[PDB]
Amino acid sequence: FKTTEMIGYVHSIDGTIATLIPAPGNPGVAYNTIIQIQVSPTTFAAGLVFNLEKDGRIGIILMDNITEVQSGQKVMATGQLLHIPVGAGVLGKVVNPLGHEVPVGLSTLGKVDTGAPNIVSRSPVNYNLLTGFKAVDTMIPIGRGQRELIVGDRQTGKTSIAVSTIINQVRINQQILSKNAVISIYVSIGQRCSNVARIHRLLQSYGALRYTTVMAATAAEPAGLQYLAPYAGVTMGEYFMNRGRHCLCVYDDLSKQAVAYRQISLLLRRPPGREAYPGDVFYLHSRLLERAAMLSPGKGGGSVTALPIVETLSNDVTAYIVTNVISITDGQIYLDTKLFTGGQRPAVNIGLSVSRVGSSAQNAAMKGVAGKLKGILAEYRKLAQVQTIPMIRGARFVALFNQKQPSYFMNAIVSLYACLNGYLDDVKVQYVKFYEYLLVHRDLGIMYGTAKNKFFYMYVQELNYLIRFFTLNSPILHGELEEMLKQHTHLFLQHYQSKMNAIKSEKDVKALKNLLYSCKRAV
Amino acid sequence: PVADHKGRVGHVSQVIGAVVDVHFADGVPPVLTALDVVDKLGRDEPLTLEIVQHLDAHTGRCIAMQTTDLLKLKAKVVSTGGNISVPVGRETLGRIFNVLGDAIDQRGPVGEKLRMPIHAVAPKLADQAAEDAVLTTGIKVIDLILPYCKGGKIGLFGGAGVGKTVIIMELINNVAKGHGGFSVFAGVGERTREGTDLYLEMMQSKVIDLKGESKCVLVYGQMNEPPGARARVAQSALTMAEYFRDVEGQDVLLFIDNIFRFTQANSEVSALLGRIPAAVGYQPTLAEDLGQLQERITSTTKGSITSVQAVYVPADDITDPAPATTFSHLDATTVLDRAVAESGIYPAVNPLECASRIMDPDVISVDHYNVAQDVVQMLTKYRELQDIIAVLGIDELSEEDKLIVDRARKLVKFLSQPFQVAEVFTGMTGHYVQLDDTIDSFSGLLMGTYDQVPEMAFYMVGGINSVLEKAKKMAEEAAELEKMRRARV
Amino acid sequence: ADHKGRVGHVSQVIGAVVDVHFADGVPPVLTALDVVDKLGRDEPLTLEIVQHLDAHTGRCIAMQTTDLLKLKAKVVSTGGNISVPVGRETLGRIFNVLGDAIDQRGPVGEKLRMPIHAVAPKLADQAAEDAVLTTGIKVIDLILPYCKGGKIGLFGGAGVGKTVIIMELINNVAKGHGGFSVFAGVGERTREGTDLYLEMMQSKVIDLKGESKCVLVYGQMNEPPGARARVAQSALTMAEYFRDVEGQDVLLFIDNIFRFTQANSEVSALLGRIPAAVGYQPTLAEDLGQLQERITSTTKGSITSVQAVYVPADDITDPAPATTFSHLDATTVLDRAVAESGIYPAVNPLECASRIMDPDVIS
Amino acid sequence: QQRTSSLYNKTRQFGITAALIEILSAMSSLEGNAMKGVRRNKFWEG
Amino acid sequence: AAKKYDLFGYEVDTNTAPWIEKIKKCKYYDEAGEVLVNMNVSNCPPDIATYNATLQCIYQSPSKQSTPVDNESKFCAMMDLLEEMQHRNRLKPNEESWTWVMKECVKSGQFRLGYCIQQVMETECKGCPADLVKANEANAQKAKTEGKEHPGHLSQQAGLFDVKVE
Numbered sequence A: 001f002k003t004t005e006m007i008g009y010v011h012s013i014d015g016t017i018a019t020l021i022p023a024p025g026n027p028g029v030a031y032n033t034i035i036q037i038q039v040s041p042t043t044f045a046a047g048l049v050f051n052l053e054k055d056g057r058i059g060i061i062l063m064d065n066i067t068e069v070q071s072g073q074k075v076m077a078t079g080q081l082l083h084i085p086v087g088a089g090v091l092g093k094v095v096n097p098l099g100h101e102v103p104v105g106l107s108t109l110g111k112v113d114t115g116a117p118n119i120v121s122r123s124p125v126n127y128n129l130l131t132g133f134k135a136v137d138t139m140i141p142i143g144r145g146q147r148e149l150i151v152g153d154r155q156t157g158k159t160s161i162a163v164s165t166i167i168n169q170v171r172i173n174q175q176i177l178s179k180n181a182v183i184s185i186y187v188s189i190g191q192r193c194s195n196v197a198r199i200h201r202l203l204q205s206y207g208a209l210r211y212t213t214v215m216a217a218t219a220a221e222p223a224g225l226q227y228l229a230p231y232a233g234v235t236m237g238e239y240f241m242n243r244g245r246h247c248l249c250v251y252d253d254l255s256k257q258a259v260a261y262r263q264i265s266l267l268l269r270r271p272p273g274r275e276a277y278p279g280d281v282f283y284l285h286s287r288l289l290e291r292a293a294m295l296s297p298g299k300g301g302g303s304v305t306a307l308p309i310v311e312t313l314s315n316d317v318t319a320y321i322v323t324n325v326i327s328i329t330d331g332q333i334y335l336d337t338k339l340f341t342g343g344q345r346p347a348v349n350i351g352l353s354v355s356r357v358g359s360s361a362q363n364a365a366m367k368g369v370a371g372k373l374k375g376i377l378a379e380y381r382k383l384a385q386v387q388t389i390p391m392i393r394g395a396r397f398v399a400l401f402n403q404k405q406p407s408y409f410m411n412a413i414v415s416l417y418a419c420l421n422g423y424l425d426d427v428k429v430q431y432v433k434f435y436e437y438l439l440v441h442r443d444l445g446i447m448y449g450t451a452k453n454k455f456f457y458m459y460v461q462e463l464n465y466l467i468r469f470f471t472l473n474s475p476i477l478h479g480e481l482e483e484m485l486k487q488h489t490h491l492f493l494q495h496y497q498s499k500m501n502a503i504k505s506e507k508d509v510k511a512l513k514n515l516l517y518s519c520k521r522a523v
Numbered sequence B: 001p002v003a004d005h006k007g008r009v010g011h012v013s014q015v016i017g018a019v020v021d022v023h024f025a026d027g028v029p030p031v032l033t034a035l036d037v038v039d040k041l042g043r044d045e046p047l048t049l050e051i052v053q054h055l056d057a058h059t060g061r062c063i064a065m066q067t068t069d070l071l072k073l074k075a076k077v078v079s080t081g082g083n084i085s086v087p088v089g090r091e092t093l094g095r096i097f098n099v100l101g102d103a104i105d106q107r108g109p110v111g112e113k114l115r116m117p118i119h120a121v122a123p124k125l126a127d128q129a130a131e132d133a134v135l136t137t138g139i140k141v142i143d144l145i146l147p148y149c150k151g152g153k154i155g156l157f158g159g160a161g162v163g164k165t166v167i168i169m170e171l172i173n174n175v176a177k178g179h180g181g182f183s184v185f186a187g188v189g190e191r192t193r194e195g196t197d198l199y200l201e202m203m204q205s206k207v208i209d210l211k212g213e214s215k216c217v218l219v220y221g222q223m224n225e226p227p228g229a230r231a232r233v234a235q236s237a238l239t240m241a242e243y244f245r246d247v248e249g250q251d252v253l254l255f256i257d258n259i260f261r262f263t264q265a266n267s268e269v270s271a272l273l274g275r276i277p278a279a280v281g282y283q284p285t286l287a288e289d290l291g292q293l294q295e296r297i298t299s300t301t302k303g304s305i306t307s308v309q310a311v312y313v314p315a316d317d318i319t320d321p322a323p324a325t326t327f328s329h330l331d332a333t334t335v336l337d338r339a340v341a342e343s344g345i346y347p348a349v350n351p352l353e354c355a356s357r358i359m360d361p362d363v364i365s366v367d368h369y370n371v372a373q374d375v376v377q378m379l380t381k382y383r384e385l386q387d388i389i390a391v392l393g394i395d396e397l398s399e400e401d402k403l404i405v406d407r408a409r410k411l412v413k414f415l416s417q418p419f420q421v422a423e424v425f426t427g428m429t430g431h432y433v434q435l436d437d438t439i440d441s442f443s444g445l446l447m448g449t450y451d452q453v454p455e456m457a458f459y460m461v462g463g464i465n466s467v468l469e470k471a472k473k474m475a476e477e478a479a480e481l482e483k484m485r486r487a488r489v
Numbered sequence C: 001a002d003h004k005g006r007v008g009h010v011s012q013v014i015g016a017v018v019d020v021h022f023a024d025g026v027p028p029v030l031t032a033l034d035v036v037d038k039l040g041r042d043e044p045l046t047l048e049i050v051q052h053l054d055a056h057t058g059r060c061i062a063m064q065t066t067d068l069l070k071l072k073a074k075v076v077s078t079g080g081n082i083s084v085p086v087g088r089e090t091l092g093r094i095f096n097v098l099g100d101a102i103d104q105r106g107p108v109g110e111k112l113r114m115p116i117h118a119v120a121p122k123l124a125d126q127a128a129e130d131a132v133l134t135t136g137i138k139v140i141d142l143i144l145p146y147c148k149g150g151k152i153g154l155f156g157g158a159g160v161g162k163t164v165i166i167m168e169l170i171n172n173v174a175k176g177h178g179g180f181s182v183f184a185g186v187g188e189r190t191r192e193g194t195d196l197y198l199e200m201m202q203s204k205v206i207d208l209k210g211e212s213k214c215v216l217v218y219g220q221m222n223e224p225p226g227a228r229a230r231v232a233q234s235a236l237t238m239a240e241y242f243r244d245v246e247g248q249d250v251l252l253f254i255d256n257i258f259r260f261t262q263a264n265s266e267v268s269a270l271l272g273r274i275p276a277a278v279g280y281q282p283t284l285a286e287d288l289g290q291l292q293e294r295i296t297s298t299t300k301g302s303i304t305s306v307q308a309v310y311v312p313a314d315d316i317t318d319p320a321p322a323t324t325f326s327h328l329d330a331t332t333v334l335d336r337a338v339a340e341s342g343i344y345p346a347v348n349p350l351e352c353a354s355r356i357m358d359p360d361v362i363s
Numbered sequence D: 001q002q003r004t005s006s007l008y009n010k011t012r013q014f015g016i017t018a019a020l021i022e023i024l025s026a027m028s029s030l031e032g033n034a035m036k037g038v039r040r041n042k043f044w045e046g
Numbered sequence E: 001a002a003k004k005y006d007l008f009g010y011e012v013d014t015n016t017a018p019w020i021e022k023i024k025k026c027k028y029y030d031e032a033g034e035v036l037v038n039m040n041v042s043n044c045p046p047d048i049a050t051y052n053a054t055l056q057c058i059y060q061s062p063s064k065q066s067t068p069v070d071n072e073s074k075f076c077a078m079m080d081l082l083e084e085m086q087h088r089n090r091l092k093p094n095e096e097s098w099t100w101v102m103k104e105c106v107k108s109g110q111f112r113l114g115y116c117i118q119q120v121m122e123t124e125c126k127g128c129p130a131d132l133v134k135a136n137e138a139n140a141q142k143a144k145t146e147g148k149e150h151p152g153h154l155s156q157q158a159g160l161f162d163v164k165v166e
């Protein structure tokens, strides 16, 4: 930061807030600008101006190095709003809301106070953003430029789903042109430093750092950084939006930002509102989530897909902050605690989840497959021993929704199509994961020399973009799809399920259980 | 004439949030006066202030319509010589405006004949109208239990994601498109994408013919806007509606979404003005602001304004001061409940908590009134019985109580309807039920002539004919299943 | 460092809040001051700077009673934050917030001291991978295994052998991992502190004539809220010394973590800050963050904390337990019914939980 | 029973918060009305 | 030449000739995407000719970038671009685009995709050139003779408990 002149001295320090007194002549400080407090002869501490009093005392919100801020220290004014580095030189790095790089154990600038696109600067979402989960991609379409909320209780996969969604883009980005590559900005707000390290290692393992940047504001950090982190993150994401590219900014999580802002407001002695929150807590998130949009073709067509996360208490979705966020986003992915603890993960409560604008962006193939799945699931919920066709397919679908890692588009859609057309009717519910693993990774037809298809094989990952083009029901890819599905089902029922139904030895039962555990965790 | 304070020079004395105090050497201009900041300040957009209080004979407290970033003390400010004025007339039709009345659609200049201030006095007693009519919306619940009145004030109360916006869009499609008069859509603190969707829908349906004659005006101050603009966009839109009503004697439709954000913005600015908060934390002048705003939304002897307003209920707390104060300012009240929505019933109207002013035999037909009253009584008794049912069970009821329960369940299912705008979410073609058809169907259902029809036949359908067709299809499916089971022997 | 021995004078005394005026400028916040005037006091008085009122006046919180305290009373800065003795000489001894041996067992004879307030480990110091902490107990090791650097929520009050489990953990961690333990009594009954000390001396975990494997840091209820809000940090600093200098897997017991929150809330209330919802201090999240974040597994060693959690009014959604659960990595629930059935340790296996129960971490 | 217990907990928390906010609002109103008078001290002696 | 408009009715640029020339002088086909991004930002949406030029650049370029990417795939990029222009722009690919895709398929040696591309071209276009079909058949026969028709690991027999889930 470039200093211009002294504008006063530090007078009082009440936690994370401070007040300055004017320098001789009252040079003046521009409102909402960044000021530097000379804590040492060579080091400075960032501060944000929030109040210009008549007497000449400036209200400051300390950002970093609060422990080294003392009354009487000189304060210099930069004269400009907060700007942070943005571009391709920040991808793969861990930064803080002030733009400083965070060391990790082995030159464009962006304004963090920019307005959102206006009414005629937007367009309907038309490009899907795949999350890699069958439930979300089918029943909860997410289009690029959409704000999708992720609500749920503590320890229910709220962070895991978003991290997997970021990871799911690695394979796609490496194949298609760089213009369509989806970049990610994971913003951690008030989380634990160990959790940030684990997330960083997980992203690095899958090579997602080339297309991802992490902004961290741990719980030990003051409220200013936590309150400012999401704005800096979206600012980093808006760089690609204004240049015809797409981003996937993620906020983990807005609840802690609200707590930090409430702390700041109460330290300033402002009228508390509902649940002691400030009156403008809604505006806090409004000015944030509004900046994520899908630009119109005239502006380039860039996008910023927001995935705000919110934590509820006892599955209470009538909280002040939860309802406020639900009133801003374009949907919600509710993660029920009962499903999660019951072994049904990611535990997406499809009944309460919804996508208000993502329906159009859904791909034609996924849209075609997902149309009937909606009715099947709706009937299955109402029906829950007479087992009709809807009940069998509903049970198989619920079994298939169990995932740990994001699934490639071709594998997920092929498995969903096979289940929808009744190819898993004879397959027992407990063997659905093993059946899917054999379908995706192995190839029974080739193994037993009974393959007739010319090109349609699951080992040909190149077919994903051909399936995405027309449909799974096109006359080009329909006959071979049906042939391979029939052969796989026949071979499975003949060889694998028949033997699995004839296991009584205790050792063999343990081996079968271990096999099922392994399959359930790997496709 | 020219104001005696136009061009008056003042200097910024204090800046706190969106509240700025300006000192005038020659005297503070009148309250509500619009001021412009002349200093460049390196800003990207101009800055405008509205006077809301007088601190002394020289200092005045103002609210900024744009962000106050890069605003220094002693910054020069010049009075505009009057309140904030917005364009009026037919030149505004088909255009998109903001709080200040600037066209934001990136099209040619408005070229309005004149402008009028956003702040105006409400109509007096002698100017009130005495006309009562029925506005057919095509929705069974509204047309039956809480019928809307032409030229009246309507409100939709609901939580987050309950269906307020969907009902507004359905009403727009079913009324505004086939409306003789003009329409004004005032977006207050709502999603900006919704404004774009509404604009595209209007253009596609030729409601806004940029190459021809349009019949709608869009005024939008959205969530991203600062609290200053969200407390005056409603005033500007209502000023345009008032001009259409009075200066032309034209029937107008005023769709406000959401009116709660107006009170919220007023509370936010009041917190900075240095006022003692009322209960919950709203400004002490909550009732007065709503009274001044709503009293202007009325039908006079010159024209008519049918206003539909969406009221947001924070945390689903219907007792909150903001929504609570709005009830007294509405002719028709539509209360939406989250629990009803979670049960698959859309719209989620809670008929027992809804009310209408034209629910009077002197206004609506006698048969309509009798059917509505019978339905309400049945629903009330069923709600009373549900308390016993949820504890002991249905089998612990009287013989006639079971009949009441079955009829009330069919009524609850029947009240649902698929909207033509929610086809994506419902996956079914929307229905438009005539007023007479609704009355006849509900009267028949009350008599009990449809006791044989399955309960689910009434779920997500239109009139009685749709119920019978769905029942026939269900009967055919059941017969097929029975034939398959019998052949299995 | 430049403010070592700086002179100041008391300017205001309102209960436990004392304002000190320095002619040369207030020392840095969180600085320990000593009241040189012991005219009639039976104990020394020490103040902690919490806020700066102006360039010369600073607000402080007293660690003892402020009785017989006059205005303009001389005060001398200690040169920095509160200092606590750290080393192998503190094993088997009882300390207070100020790091003074209250066991009347001779001088501590420490070789070094550390400040109470230390920044949490940086993101670069975090452990490469999660590791299990073998406690030696079949139930814990199997169903709810502990992780190095993790926080365990110990539910279930007295009557379920909670102290016995604590002593067993202290013994097992030293037996297997060779790491010491630090027990912090925050707002604890003095009688229960004496009982725990006697039990530890009886079980030889604190051997007066031999080698002890536990440090006791007690902040009792009768002490003012200024001490109950820093005893935990003193114990954590003692644990951090072993974690860093000696590179061990240390244990840190907190009894209770709710008392820490209550003490911080009271301290904030005294300063006049507006309480948040329910009535806890507005910095409730930050107060717990500045403490829990210091408990982690670094590249040198680790500190696994077993914190006894109390749920006020049996409301699991209360801000205190709700905020606390966001930092817990495991949960050990103790039930009286299990104890009455003759099962010891009285652990309800189906009520416990752990996050490392994942193949990616454990075998 | 579970639903009523949840409502009971929620209601008590809201009541405590509302009462505390009301008391603090009254205190702030009392503090605001207070005005700092002219200081009668030897300003020159400094 | 004729006036063109976007969703809001605002006039849109149509002079795409300079951008095609810029695409023609790209060494790595990842630079072609940048040109398309610049076109979109400059309110000059690509047309059928621009997409054909981009496909030609992809076919004729050595690799995606100067440094190798982990999973470079020209076919994936071509299909993604075709899906874009078809679904998100409403432009039917002409015979030129499918011929470029088939040329890429036969050049890389992915004969199995050649069958699907040939069927697609026959269904949409009048027919596929015999030269490309002959080259694809030659590649398939060469693969079959060497026994490389399918991956080796897929042909291995594995019973119920002999499957390595891994």
Ligand SMILES: Nc1ncnc2c1ncn2[C@@H]1O[C@H](COP(=O)(O)OP(=O)(O)OP(=O)(O)O)[C@@H](O)[C@H]1O
Binding pocket: A153, A154, A155, A156, A157, A158, A159, A160, A161, A345, A346, A403, A404, A405, C326, C355, C356, C358
């Ligand atoms: N789909 C899944 N399959 C299996 N395990 C999962 C899945 N999703 C999450 N988990 C596991 O569940 C646990 C909790 O997940 P996660 O950390 O994402 O939750 P959270 O909502 O972020 O909770 P917190 O409040 O602690 O951040 C972790 O051990 C994680 O590995």
Ligand SMILES: Nc1ncnc2c1ncn2[C@@H]1O[C@H](COP(=O)(O)OP(=O)(O)OP(=O)(O)O)[C@@H](O)[C@H]1O
Binding pocket: A326, A327, A328, A354, A355, A356, B158, B159, B160, B161, B162, B163, B164, B165, B166, B167, B312, B346, B347, B419, B422, B425, B426
């Ligand atoms: N009549 C309806 N039929 C079917 N689904 C509906 C209907 N009304 C609402 N919904 C569902 O509820 C969702 C939210 O509806 P809507 O946009 O009207 O919310 P709202 O009341 O405006 O809330 P907020 O604006 O605060 O988010 C819709 O996306 C849709 O899934």
Ligand SMILES: [Mg+2]
Binding pocket: A158, A159, A160
């Ligand atoms: Mg998480």
Ligand SMILES: [Mg+2]
Binding pocket: B164, B165
């Ligand atoms: Mg809405």
